[PDB]
Ligand SMILES: CCCCCC/C=C/CCCCCCCC(=O)OC[C@H](O)CO
Ligand SMILES: CCCCCC/C=C/CCCCCCCC(=O)OC[C@H](O)CO
Ligand SMILES: CCCCCC/C=C\CCCCCCCC(=O)OC[C@@H](O)CO
Ligand SMILES: CCCCCC/C=C\CCCCCCCC(=O)OC[C@@H](O)CO
Ligand SMILES: CCCCCC/C=C\CCCCCCCC(=O)OC[C@H](O)CO
Ligand SMILES: CCCCCC/C=C\CCCCCCCC(=O)OC[C@H](O)CO
């Protein structure tokens with residue numbers, strides 16, 4: 001007896017991530033619209049450009065938090081307590097939004113989910129590898145199955161949560177996200193005690209006695225310096241919300257910038273720079289689906305007969321549809337890796353180029369077919385299949401996605417009804433050209 005040929009413990013972790021992704025993307029599907037609503041009632045005193053910027057920097061901090069969660073679990077608390085307490089924080093963050101509060105609850109909700117996702121997301125994937133020995137060949141199949149559960153939750157969540165918001169309002173809809181995470185906790189807690197190795201209730205590489213102090217010193221210097229920067233900012237008058245967002249943008253971009261300049265000072269690392277740039281730029285476009293495309297859907301689409309948040313379901317839908325195809329394709333000369341990044345960046349560019357057409361053809365004061373966004377997501381997910389689809393590279397994928405959203409925090413403020421065609425054309429064409437450049441550089445990168 002198995003779970004699709006895999007250890008029974010996989011079903012638990014399958015369902016665990018399935019409901020966490022449910023809570024996350026269900027929230028992402030309506031959070032921007034919710035901020036619009038808080039703005040329209042005068043409760044929240046920001047612009048839509050700022051609200052869009054918040055969404056992007058929100059995502060950036062979540063991925064950045066994922067780079068640290070692996071460390072905390074492996075060295076301090078253990079992977080299983082990390083997943084559990086990570087989930088509790090995630091749940092609380094959604095409960096905060098379900099409460100009878102307004103804009104005041106936003107920062108509290110955001111902080112909880114960032115810390116929570118940081119603990120849970122990288123360690124659930126870790127616990128998946130736990131299910132297998134070193135020798136096991138089923139590993140790639142199990143992770144593929146595990147990925148499928150991730151996409152399932154991301155698919156049904158905007159459908160359920162989005163419809164709930166339409167029927168019973170925002171507070172009820174956010175509570176469904178909280179309930180979704182709660183279900184994941186029940187299955188994880190009681191299912192884990194049956195199938196998970198008790199060895200991972202504790203850290204696998206616990207701090208040696210002499211390691212405690214320097215780690216404590218290192219963290220303290222980071223917090224103090226960060227606190228110091230904020231102090232100076234408020235002194236010189238850079239203390240509006242766009243200022244703090246720019247600070248986090250700088251921090252998010254500085255982290256890979258420093259690590260590169262660190263390692264650079266044989267030099268094949270230099271050859272990874274274009275790949276990392278290509279990764280950042282792709283994630284920038286892909287992550288704008290929940291921000292820019294979510295805005296386009298709500299303002300420019302004939303979606304009068306269905307919840308407009310449902311458009312967020314297209315991303316994991318096309319992933320699930322494309323996956324068995326590419327699974328077959330990579331088994332049936334297979335193109336190199338820098339080539340995949342170059343072509344993947346092109347498809348992302350075409351997705352934005354396509355969106356420039358309806359505005360250029362019909363104008364931007366009317367409403368267009370929902371099929372335009374359908375074709376756009378189909379293009380960028382096609383590009384995803386080439387670039388994105390575990391170990392130590394998990395950090396770089398967390399980093400690349402984090403930097404992209406940080407870049408988005410700046411870029412999405414430029415998007416509006418007046419700048420629609422220009423926004424989609426330039427960045428659309430811009431990504432295609434850099435995809436062409438990467439093709440020219442593709443041969444050198446191979447062999448390094
Ligand atoms: C294989 C599927 C291919 C997917 C097709 C994607 C589109 C490709 C070319 C059109 C993009 C640029 C559209 C032109 C935008 C443009 O003309 O901007 C000025 C405008 O006229 C000002 O009003
Ligand atoms: C399959 C296509 C293969 C790739 C072909 C690439 C096509 C690019 C067309 C857009 C170029 C820009 C033209 C429109 C720019 C535009 O709208 O500018 C407004 C004004 O500058 C606002 O400042
Ligand atoms: C990828 C192959 C299939 C699609 C190829 C893309 C072909 C055309 C896309 C770009 C042009 C679309 C037409 C937009 C309208 C326009 O330009 O307004 C002209 C301006 O003077 C206003 O009066
Ligand atoms: C066998 C699968 C091969 C996969 C190739 C699929 C490629 C593209 C999918 C269909 C895209 C065509 C749509 C463009 C033509 C169009 O919009 O004209 C509008 C017309 O309807 C007016 O009413
Ligand atoms: C939030 C309600 C969801 C249901 C929770 C059950 C109620 C109480 C559990 C005891 C306290 C929690 C202690 C958990 C610490 C922990 O590491 O859990 C790893 C777990 O054994 C892996 O399956
Ligand atoms: C920790 C236990 C597990 C977690 C359980 C999930 C959390 C809350 C569930 C109920 C939410 C009810 C929310 C009530 C909606 C509300 O406040 O009012 C709407 C508004 O008035 C309609 O217009």
Ligand SMILES: CCCCCC/C=C\CCCCCCCC(=O)OC[C@H](O)CO
Nearest residue numbers: 072076077206207208209212215216219
């Ligand atoms: C628990 C969630 C995160 C907690 C924030 C801590 C972050 C930085 C402080 C570093 C030292 C803290 C770790 C405690 C050291 C410790 O547990 O001792 C091990 C060993 O048993 C002694 O040799």
Ligand SMILES: CCCCCC/C=C\CCCCCCCC(=O)OC[C@H](O)CO
Nearest residue numbers: 238239240242243246247250251254255
């Ligand atoms: C890896 C550590 C992080 C990297 C080191 C960072 C060093 C200094 C931070 C830049 C200044 C922060 C202040 C930015 C705020 C800002 O730009 O203000 C505009 C706003 O329009 C004013 O209202």
Ligand SMILES: CCCCCC/C=C\CCCCCCCC(=O)OC[C@H](O)CO
Nearest residue numbers: 354368369371372374375376378379382
């Ligand atoms: C596997 C990747 C597949 C490639 C994806 C890209 C293909 C087509 C783009 C969307 C279709 C154009 C939009 C059609 C709009 C339409 O149906 O016209 C009625 C509406 O009322 C007019 O606005």
Ligand SMILES: CCCCCC/C=C\CCCCCCCC(=O)OC[C@H](O)CO
Nearest residue numbers: 336339436437438439440441442443444
């Ligand atoms: C509307 C008119 C616009 C014209 C559109 C033309 C589209 C593609 C042509 C350039 C392709 C260059 C790609 C190959 C160049 C090259 O040197 O590639 C070596 C590389 O090492 C191989 O992997």
